[PDB]
Design a protein around this ligand. Structure first.
Ligand SMILES: [Mg+2]
Ligand SMILES: [Mg+2]
Ligand SMILES: [Mg+2]
Ligand SMILES: [Mg+2]
Ligand SMILES: [Mg+2]
Ligand SMILES: [Mg+2]
Ligand SMILES: [Mg+2]
Ligand SMILES: [Mg+2]
Ligand SMILES: [Mg+2]
Ligand SMILES: [Mg+2]
Ligand SMILES: [Mg+2]
Ligand SMILES: [Mg+2]
Ligand SMILES: [Mg+2]
Ligand SMILES: [Mg+2]
Ligand SMILES: [Mg+2]
Ligand SMILES: [Mg+2]
Ligand SMILES: [Mg+2]
Ligand SMILES: [Mg+2]
Ligand SMILES: [Mg+2]
Ligand SMILES: [Mg+2]
Ligand SMILES: [Mg+2]
Ligand SMILES: [Mg+2]
Ligand SMILES: [Mg+2]
Ligand SMILES: [Mg+2]
Ligand SMILES: [Mg+2]
Ligand SMILES: [Mg+2]
Ligand SMILES: [Mg+2]
Ligand SMILES: [Mg+2]
Ligand SMILES: [Mg+2]
Ligand SMILES: [Mg+2]
Lengths: 130, 144, 134, 53, 185
RNA sequence: AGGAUAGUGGCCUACCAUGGUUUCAACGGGUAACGGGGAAUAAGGGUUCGAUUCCGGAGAGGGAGCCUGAGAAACGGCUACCACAUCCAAGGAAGGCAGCAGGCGCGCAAAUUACCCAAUCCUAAUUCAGGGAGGUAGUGACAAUAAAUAACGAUACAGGGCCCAUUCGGGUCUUGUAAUUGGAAUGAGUACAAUGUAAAUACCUUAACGAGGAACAAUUGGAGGGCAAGUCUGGUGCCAGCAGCC
């Protein structure tokens, strides 16, 4: 659809069901206090193909799946759990760092709001675009 | 006789005079003319989300001193640029360039207020969070 | 042998539905929320019917407790009870058990799939088997 | 320049409150105001006031 | 769609909010009758003036008027029926004189303290709320019940709840239970 | 006069006439206009609104056209064109949520791709089948009803009505301060059980569990005036900032 992102990961414990309350723990969370912790639920779990995804209601641990219902709450990567003090997972650094860079201004003067949401939506799409 | 028609068959001129003389009522005219929509940077909306173009404080007006801490705001719904007060002690470190921001009216039913020349709106939320919850150490701006 | 003292009011006989219908008032002080199955095993001993021909439902119990109210009715024969009572109540007493057929989404979902097919598709299995591929 | 946003909300030396016994948030609050308004409310002083000095 | 389940509102707020005299007069009754809201007074004064100014309209009706009599001695019917008028007054006019004060006095919260039974109204409500007192075989726990003087004496405690037999109370039983060990055995 | 319609009628056609509306507002223009039963505020009189639980009307992306049928100018019917736009092996094919869900967009502004025909009812060849009509639950501080967040003591402290009395008061009635202290009462929860229901969830009934302050910890704005409440304490010093108005 227009710019709204399944979330794509693999689960290592428990299960995941369509319509399930979960805590998302972003890259900065620690089990102690206010951190990257949003507590909303999952609209649909869905397993993916050559971009057609097949909604499934329950998924065990050890598989890769998609997750539509989030990405208002994720920015690039995250680890969501069900336990109060389940720590995060190591931050997963790659061998390329964001180095080539240009300035972006909007051609017309008034599309600017469309440009600032785009950067947010762009940050989401690629794992290390800044 | 007291200067208006008083016959029993008078009720046409009576009802019609009242209609013309209603135009001398200021807010009746504001309602019929639709200056709600043609003029006035809102559409008649209670509030309007906008975009912070530049932080800018503007002169006070006499009798008082004290710079006034506003922001020129581009409105999302019509790209009109307007300025609005950011009220409180501090409350300008809380805004950066290009923060989304929700502007409310000011109380005087349009047509600017108090210390300040020509500014009719005030900030309430900036990047989704109320100034109050930010001005007190209640809440915190989202992660840039 | 406790003071459970159940009334029964507004008893009027319904031949056309082969039963007597009536409201029940179980005045049960020093006791809370007496069950429905227990509200028959010696209840049929009061209207002299046999024990699987009765039915009762309703039953929200007064604020403050000590008495529940609801509606019941007894049948002129258990054979007609199995014919007249709703096909969901006999489930509640085990006198029927309704079918496992899949969720109504699947029922509708397959209802629609079978509009895609005109006749029997018995010629269709002959279609696809020779193909796939060449 | 901008320069003076947090000019006082910062420079006030921020002090803590007093972790004092809880007041009776409910009906009895109306009760103890009825009491510290009419009955032995030894808050009278001339005609009346409601703040110390 | 559906059919609208109607609702009314039960109070009415004063027009000037900071009348000095009115502000104290209200707290005097909250103290007198152990109430918690100002709404609890606003509720009656609105309801009264609802009933009151809906009886002003009943006498510009010039008299012997058929609707005046039927809704007359069948309104007054309801107002000593709830003990806010006398049987020594069966004749229609002092109804407009009636103050808010008379209504509070037949709240069940206030009637408790006045039938002995509480020794204080703040003590009355707190016990009205805790599945103590009943009127018939019927527990009530709403500090505004408006006894009818047809049930002004059926008001007793509850046969559930200690104070009426059969149960001794969670706080007590759990306390005296721990004296098993130290009673000797 | 005729044609056409189910039928009256400039409805249409041939011929003929020059009439028809209007300052008692015709005609035009605007409506951020579906109409109404109603909604809000109201001493009275009125002022403002009515997309929206009922009734009537109009539409099914926009126009027009038509089939079948008693009934459609139908759109979860077909056909053409206009605007979008899906799939393709490039040959072709297929489109219509202002139905229920869900999503995009728009925005200040509005919910779950859940369960079910048990109820209300509707349809059918029909007692059974079907119904996102409708009902159940989820979301839900739009609006409304009721009304928890404490009660009562003791001790120590604080003041004052009193037979026989010269009274530190001898005795008095009630009454407030402080982490000084006591035993009762309870649901918010949590939970066997039944009840509840189509099956469930909460409601009500309820075994057992569930209260002393650092809690089962109430908020929102205010304290010069209007306008209820500070000539308190510290900070700043026409600065920060407050201020509907002054
Ligand atoms: Mg997209
Ligand atoms: Mg004339
Ligand atoms: Mg004009
Ligand atoms: Mg004029
Ligand atoms: Mg002029
Ligand atoms: Mg001035
Ligand atoms: Mg938003
Ligand atoms: Mg009880
Ligand atoms: Mg003709
Ligand atoms: Mg209009
Ligand atoms: Mg319109
Ligand atoms: Mg209208
Ligand atoms: Mg309208
Ligand atoms: Mg309407
Ligand atoms: Mg509209
Ligand atoms: Mg139509
Ligand atoms: Mg059509
Ligand atoms: Mg459709
Ligand atoms: Mg249709
Ligand atoms: Mg549409
Ligand atoms: Mg948005
Ligand atoms: Mg809303
Ligand atoms: Mg929305
Ligand atoms: Mg049905
Ligand atoms: Mg059926
Ligand atoms: Mg509410
Ligand atoms: Mg609380
Ligand atoms: Mg202050
Ligand atoms: Mg004052
Ligand atoms: Mg202030």
């Amino acid at each position: 659809d227009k710019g709204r992102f399944y979330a794509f990961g693999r689960v290592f414990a428990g299960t995941v069901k369509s319509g399930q309350k979960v805590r998302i723990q972003g890259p900065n969370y620690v089990p102690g206090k206010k951190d990257d912790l949003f507590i909303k639920a999952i609209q649909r779990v869905v397993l993916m193909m050559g971009r057609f995804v097949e909604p499934i209601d329950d998924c065990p641990a050890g598989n890769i799946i998609g997750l539509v219902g989030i990405d208002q709450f994720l920015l690039k990567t995250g680890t969501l759990t069900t336990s109060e003090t389940a720590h995060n997972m190591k931050v997963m650094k790659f061998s390329v760092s964001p180095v080539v860079q240009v300035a972006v201004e909007v051609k017309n003067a008034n599309d600017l709001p469309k440009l600032v949401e785009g950067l947010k939506r762009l940050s989401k799409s690629d794992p290390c675009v800044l | 006789g007291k200067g208006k028609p008083r016959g029993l068959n008078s009720a046409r001129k009576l009802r019609v005079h009242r209609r013309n003389n209603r135009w001398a009522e200021n807010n009746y005219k504001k309602r019929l003319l639709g200056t709600a929509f043609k003029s006035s940077p809102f559409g008649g909306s209670s509030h309007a989300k906008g975009i912070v173009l530049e932080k800018l404080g503007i002169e006070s007006k006499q009798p008082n001193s004290a710079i006034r801490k506003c922001v020129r705001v581009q409105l999302i719904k019509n790209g009109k640029k307007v300025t609005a007060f950011v009220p409180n002690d501090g409350c300008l470190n809380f805004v950066d360039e290009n923060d989304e921001v929700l502007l409310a009216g000011f109380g005087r039913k349009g047509k600017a207020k108090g210390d300040i020349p020509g500014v009719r709106f005030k900030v309430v939320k900036v990047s989704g969070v109320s100034l109050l919850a930010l001005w007190k150490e209640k809440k915190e701006k989202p992660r840039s | 042998s406790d003071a459970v003292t159940i009334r029964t009011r507004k008893v009027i006989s319904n031949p056309l539905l082969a039963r007597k219908q009536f409201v029940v008032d179980v005045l049960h002080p020093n006791r809370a929320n007496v069950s429905k199955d227990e509200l028959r095993e010696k209840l049929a001993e009061v209207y002299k019917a046999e024990k699987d021909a009765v039915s009762v439902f309703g039953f929200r119990t007064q604020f403050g407790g000590g008495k529940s109210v609801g509606f019941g009715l007894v049948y002129n024969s258990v054979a007609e009870a199995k014919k007249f009572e709703p096909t969901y109540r006999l489930v509640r007493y085990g006198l029927a058990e309704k079918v496992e057929k899949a969720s109504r989404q699947q029922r509708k979902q397959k209802k629609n799939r079978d509009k895609k097919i005109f006749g029997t598709g018995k010629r269709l299995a002959k279609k696809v088997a020779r193909r796939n591929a060449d | 320049s901008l320069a003076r946003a947090g000019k006082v909300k910062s420079q006030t030396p921020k002090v803590e409150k007093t972790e004092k016994p809880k007041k009776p948030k409910g009906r009895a609050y109306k009760r103890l105001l009825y009491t510290r308004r009419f009955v032995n409310v030894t808050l009278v002083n001339g005609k009346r006031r409601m703040n110390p000095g | 769609p559906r059919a609208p389940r109607t609702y009314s509102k039960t109070y009415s707020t004063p027009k000037r909010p900071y009348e000095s005299s009115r502000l104290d007069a209200e707290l005097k009754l909250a103290g007198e009758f152990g109430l918690k809201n100002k709404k609890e007074i606003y509720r009656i004064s609105f309801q009264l003036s609802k009933i009151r100014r809906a009886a002003r309209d009943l006498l510009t009706r010039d008299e012997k008027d058929p609707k005046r009599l039927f809704e007359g001695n069948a309104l007054i019917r309801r107002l000593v029926r709830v003990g806010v008028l006398s049987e020594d007054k069966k004749k229609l006019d002092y109804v407009l004189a009636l103050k808010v004060e008379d209504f509070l006095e037949r709240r069940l919260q206030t009637q408790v303290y006045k039938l002995g039974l509480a020794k204080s109204v703040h003590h009355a409500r707190v016990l009205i709320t805790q599945r103590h007192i009943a009127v018939g075989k019927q527990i009530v726990n709403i500090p505004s019940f408006m006894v009818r003087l047809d049930s002004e004496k059926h008001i007793d405690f509850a046969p559930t709840s200690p104070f009426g037999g059969a149960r001794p109370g969670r706080v007590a039983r759990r306390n005296a239970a721990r004296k098993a060990e130290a009673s000797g055995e």
